[PDB]
Amino acid sequence: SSWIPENIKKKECVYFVESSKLSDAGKVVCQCGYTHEQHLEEATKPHTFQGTQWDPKKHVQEMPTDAFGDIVFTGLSQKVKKYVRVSQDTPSSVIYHLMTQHWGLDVPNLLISVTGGAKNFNMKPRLKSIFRRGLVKVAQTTGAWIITGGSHTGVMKQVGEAVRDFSLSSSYKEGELITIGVATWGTVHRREGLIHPTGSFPAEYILDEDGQGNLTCLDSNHSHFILVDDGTHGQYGVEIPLRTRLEKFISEQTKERGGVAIKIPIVCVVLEGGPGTLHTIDNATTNGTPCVVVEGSGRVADVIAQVANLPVSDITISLIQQKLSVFFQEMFETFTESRIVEWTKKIQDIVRRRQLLTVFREGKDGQQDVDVAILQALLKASRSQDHFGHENWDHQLKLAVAWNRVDIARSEIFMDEWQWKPSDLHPTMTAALISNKPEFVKLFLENGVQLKEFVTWDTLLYLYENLDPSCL
Amino acid sequence: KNFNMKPRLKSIFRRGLVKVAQTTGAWIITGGSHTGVMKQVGEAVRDFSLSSSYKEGELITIGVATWGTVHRREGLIHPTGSFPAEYIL
Amino acid sequence: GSGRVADVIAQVANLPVSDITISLIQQKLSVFFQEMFETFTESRIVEWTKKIQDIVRRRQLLTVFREGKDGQQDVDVAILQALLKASRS
Amino acid sequence: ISNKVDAMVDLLDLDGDSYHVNARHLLYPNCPVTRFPVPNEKVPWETEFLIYDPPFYTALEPLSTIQYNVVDGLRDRRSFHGPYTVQAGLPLNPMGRTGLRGRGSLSCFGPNHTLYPMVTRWRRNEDGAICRKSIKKMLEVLVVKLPLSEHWALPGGSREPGEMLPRKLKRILRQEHWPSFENLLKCGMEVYKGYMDDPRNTDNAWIETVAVSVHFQDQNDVELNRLNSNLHACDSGASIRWQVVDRRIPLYANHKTLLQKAAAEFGAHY
Amino acid sequence: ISNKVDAMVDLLDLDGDSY
Ligand SMILES: Nc1ncnc2c1ncn2[C@H]1C[C@H](O)[C@@H](COP(=O)(O)OP(=O)(O)O)O1
Ligand SMILES: [Zn+2]
């Protein structure tokens, strides 16, 4: 409570230009997004003549944050949920510093990310079933961290409703999942009351979806909340670069096993979407994240599906208009000619990096939950990639034994070689025994790891430490 | 002394050895040394011979080696004959 | 599948002797002559083509036993196939 | 039966511009600017750029007393790709632009030269045995890292006039061996001379490269490798490590395409 | 088995004045 407003800062607009904009339903706006009545404390008055035209970055300076605490809702959920306010230029290093010992969160083991459409979405049954089943299967095992925005809209709300569908019946009870929400301070309905000078921490946020009007209310659905600010009011799509940078930083350098480096497997999955989803995928691909698209979601899945493995050159603008009439139907009105043509750069950028994008067939390929697609993406972008080393190999298998995919284990053997010594498979078979899947230990015995030197005194003590609580 | 082991090759070699040696009067010809599969042919020989109805030696395994390539030659030479022929391994 | 000698003979047994060149020997010198490359010299590498050619051109006295796809059993099938090929035919 | 019918099903079911994009790098590094979309059908100059509003970031037209694309002294002021073209008053960089004009926050005017050296030392275990590659001889190429950087950088850069040493080879490296390697560094065949796909180029200037490929028959080949290493002492770098730079080296994305063509320097299989 | 053989049968069977 004494480390923040000291190491985490905020960015605001230091003067007003009152450009002639009505902000739809409203009474005049600067361009800052706020009004003259509430535009900081001295920023309402003009600071001499800095400039007669608005461009944010040249004049803005830094002031500390004022939004921190833990949100407790009236009746929706009687539990503690932490939230922090972050700036746009804040490095991810200090943010990870905040997560580990300032919030009491352990090191991640999986960093699946979910992005999708907000207030432009539609529902069908078996897609919902697939999404929910994949969510609980990936989140209940290991220490997977699911990263998603902040809002209660569509599949974005359904990820959380699946979270509590699993959490209502849980042996450990309380919170077995760490779901982090990311949103922009500008796009928050009930900001009044979320600001405190030093700290009070009731952080009351009633979910009043009726009075939101134009800014979607924050969900009651994410365990941790990240609320970014850039100086913009009601502008979505601002946190796209920062989210990608943060997830990357928490991807490669949070563990030091082996004495050099450990790269935690990471996948971002997209369902439906629009321009903001396109920007998210583009920034994610530029940073170096494997991405998977679930086909059939609508209006975004097919376009990426039928350009993923196709050559980049033949993808023309004309092809974009032929793809603009079937899966850009309801969003054609908001798309203008100067705005339509931005859909070819980002798609080309994502496609030409074929090592970080895969398509998940809904009907004919991988007819199962999202585990097969996610692990295929991880093995394609982890083992076959020219950048990653040999240390993380031991971690793809530890991830795979949880997903009980032994055909993939057979497949991955043929291209890697553990010529040094087979003894590196003892730690993974320790976890295989607790996961209890016998095909993996059968593979281990047929590979030739001898059980004579495996079970040691400390090894058997650790195995006896992890009996199944269900049995007597 | 230049060899490596893997399980199912060992199983195939051993199974073939006992099946071919236990039936008929097959003579298995092999060198003299305890190294690798060269040692494993013999270890299969005693793996079969330890449990045998006729007992004693049901197999005739001949070893061929060069006198030059013998470690403990001292004591293997006799003028006419004493025949304890002690050779500690 | 045994290693460093089995594949080389396997993929030259039924192949024509003429196309087996010295260059083919060096392409076979990098994958199954890895640990023995140090002891093999240029004057000693080239002796690996005469003996292989001599064994191969007598196709009636050499056979290859597939570990996985042909004769998936103990060595009896391969041995009897060799005996019938070199005995009756 | 149930799984053999499955194994039976599978097999009887069977029985436009691709040009440089890295130059037009979105999210230009070291600058807070975003680009308008310039598709792959919009890479050539002849196509009409409907939304052409390029950035004007320069942290100026310093064209006075400096003849661009001309023969001005021993400055390498000529573009090797034939005559240049001008678009109204502002000339266009051949191949493509990247998003910076003039000189920018760089060292000085002229070209942002590059001069990549390389050193080889035999692998000592007990007498100097060689660990080959899977197929052919993979000679131990080696690179170094900049003292404060996230990437490995060879001791090269913009060639200072009259010196030919880009301030990084003569310093923070070996001592008392400077004159020896300078003669060798100007004796070799190039890997590529021309504009190259990097997100750190300029519209008014570009990179002219000089490269030399040299192999030492012994790790003690005079003072080039043995005495140079014996007289080299940094004593300031926080981290140091030595590895053979195979496909595992995280160099520039610029350098991978250069290496794809420079693999022919030795003819070995990478 | 009974319906997969049926699904198997189908595809290998294959694999003047107009005024
Ligand atoms: N390949 C490259 N081309 C141009 N600038 C590069 C570059 N790689 C890195 N830079 C940038 C990062 C440094 O902060 C900056 C320093 O530039 P400088 O040394 O002042 O001039 P110059 O780029 O001519 O050498 O160069
Ligand atoms: Zn304002």
- State the DSSP string of C1-54: --SSSHHHHHTTSSS-STT--HHHHHHTTTTSSSTTTTT--HHHHTHHHHHHHH
Cα distance from D132 to chain C (closest Cα, Å)?
9
**Structure solved using which method?**
cryo-EM
CA A442/CA A455 separation, integer angstroms: 16
CA C13/CA C52 separation, integer angstroms: 9
Å resolution of this model?
4.6
Q: Which of A311, A348, A289, A317 is nearest to D24 (CA)?
A: A348
* B9 close to C (CB below 8 A): yes
Q: Strand ranges (DSSP E) for A120-279?
A: 146-149, 179-184, 224-229, 268-271
Q: Which residue of E has its CA nearest to D2?
A: E1
The structure tokens 């208009």 sit at A321
Phi (first) and psi of residue A60, to 5 degrees:
-75, 145
- Quick one: CA dihedral D120, D125, D128, D131, positive or negative? negative
Contacts of A249 (CB under 8 A, 6+ apart): A92, A93, A95, A96
Could you tell me how many CB contacts below 8 A there are between chain B and chain C? Answer: 19
| Element holding A360 (H helix, E strand) | strand A357-360
Test E5 with D5 for CB contact under 8 angstroms: yes
Cα distance from E1 to chain D (closest Cα, Å)?
6
**Residues A440 and A432: beta-carbon distance below 8 Å:** yes
CA A149/CA A156 separation, integer angstroms: 8
D contacts of A348 (beta carbons < 8 Å): 21, 39-40
D106 CA from centroid of ligand 1 (Å): 6
Q: Which residue of C has its CA nearest to D130?
A: C38
Q: For residue A265, count CB atoms less than 10 angstroms from its CB and return exposed for 0-12, middle for 13-18, buried for 19 or more.
A: buried
Phi (first) and psi of residue A10, to 5 degrees:
-140, 155
**Residues A355 and A384: beta-carbon distance below 8 Å:** yes
Parallel, antiparallel or unpaired: strands A68-71 and A62-64: unpaired
| Element holding B31 (H helix, E strand) | strand B28-31
The structure tokens 């001069």 sit at D115
Pick from D107, D112, D160 the residue to mutate for probing ligand 1's pocket: most ligand atoms within 8 Å of its CB. D112
For residue A23, the cross-strand partners are none
Q: Which of C2, C85, C81, C15 is nearest to C53 (CA)?
A: C15
C39 alpha-carbon distance from chain centroid = 20
Test A446 with B6 for CB contact under 8 angstroms: no
In angstroms, the Cα distances linking A383 to A376, A389, A392, A403, A414 are 10, 8, 8, 18, 12
Nearest-CB residue to C74 (from B2, B4, B16): B16
**Residues A334 and A324: beta-carbon distance below 8 Å:** no
In angstroms, the Cα distances linking B56 to B21, B60, D243 are 15, 11, 60
In angstroms, the Cα distances linking D83 to D59, D78, D203 are 29, 9, 16
C contacts of B12 (beta carbons < 8 Å): 67, 74-75
- Assess whether the C-beta atom of D197 lies below 6 angstroms from ligand 1: no
- b/e D131-170 (16+ beta carbons within 10 angstroms → b): eeeeeeebbbbebbeeeeeeebbbbbbbbeeeeebbebbb
In the numeric block, which tokens belong to residue D231?
């007289």
Ligand 1 atom nearest residue D198's Cα: 1
B contacts of C67 (beta carbons < 8 Å): 9, 12
Q: How far apart are the first and last CA of chain E?
A: 53
Test C75 with B4 for CB contact under 8 angstroms: no
The HSE-up count of residue A262 (CA atoms within 13 Å, CB side) is 14
Test A286 with D27 for CB contact under 8 angstroms: yes
- Assess whether the C-beta atom of D106 lies below 6 angstroms from ligand 1: yes
CA A109/CA A354 separation, integer angstroms: 25
CA D51/CA C18 separation, integer angstroms: 66
Long-range residue pairs from D167-171, CB within 8 A, at least 24 positions apart, any chain: D169/D115, D169/D117
CA B89/CA A122 separation, integer angstroms: 80
In angstroms, the Cα distances linking A242 to A89, A153, A228, D90 are 8, 22, 9, 36
The structure tokens 């009067």 sit at B25
* Polymer length in residues for chain B: 89
Question: Do the chains C and D touch each other, judged by at least 3 C-beta pairs below 8 angstroms?
Answer: yes
- The alpha-helical segments, DSSP class H, found in A253-316 are 275-287, 301-305
A60 CA from centroid of ligand 2 (Å): 11
Cα distance from B69 to chain A (closest Cα, Å)?
32
Amino acid at A99: M
* C39 close to D (CB below 8 A): no
Q: Which of D191, D193, D181, D183 is nearest to D221 (CA)?
A: D181
Q: How far apart are the first and last CA of chain A?
A: 44
Nearby residues for ligand 2 (ion, Cβ within 5 Å): A 16, 30, 32, 39
Q: Which of D188, D187, D167, D189 is nearest to D178 (CA)?
A: D167
Phi (first) and psi of residue D20, to 5 degrees:
-60, 130
| Element holding A306 (H helix, E strand) | none
Contacts of A371 (CB under 8 A, 6+ apart): A134, A137, A138, A403, A405
Cα distance from D13 to chain E (closest Cα, Å)?
7
- Assess whether the C-beta atom of D200 lies below 6 angstroms from ligand 1: yes
Q: How far apart are the first and last CA of chain C?
A: 28
Contacts of D119 (CB under 8 A, 6+ apart): D142, D216, D224, D225, D228
